[PDB]
Amino acid sequence: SLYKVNEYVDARDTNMGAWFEAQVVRVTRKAEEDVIYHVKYDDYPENGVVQMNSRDVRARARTIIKWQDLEVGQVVMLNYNPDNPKERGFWYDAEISRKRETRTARELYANVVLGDDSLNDCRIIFVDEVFKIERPGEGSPMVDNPMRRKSGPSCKHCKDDVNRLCRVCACHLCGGRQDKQLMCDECDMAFHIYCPPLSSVPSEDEWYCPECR
């Protein structure tokens, strides 16, 4: 096939349109590149091995396109958070639509492609993190463990210090990033399972931490 076992790739989630860093575990066919890629996601072990349609797997992004090399009409992979456009989000494919540089800002606008429809004229915040989309056949396969893209969003208060105290992005009681963490639905603040007891993630669609009742 195009992509071999153990090869590092990006796999697209067909619901949200985002591409995720993943790795090829097994390759099977159905009946020509209409094959099935069995990928495990780098930082989502809980999802185990997912099956991907070949149209949704490409070689792992590696090459950054500098602001000065960005041309309008160019189709790239960049970071956007459609629910919070001022924050970091996930990795989507976009056609660059407009650039404006003034004394104070470099302004990148592009049409972000989501799950089904597109999202015209988005103001891209992360201008120094635009990836070239690897083309099939061209370019080498990624076989050595690569550096990680940053995906969001970011705790403004702990600055994602993946080694620090945080009564926000982590347990509102402690903060320990210590699969089965559960979250308020009024405050949106996260809680553990322990911090009275528990057993096996409730039926109920909603569920609560004391300060919002």
Partner: peptide, 10 residues
């Protein structure tokens, strides 16, 4: 029942 595994995708 909202798990921080679940929501880990905005």
């Amino acid at each position: 029942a909202r798990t921080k595994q679940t929501a880990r995708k905005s």
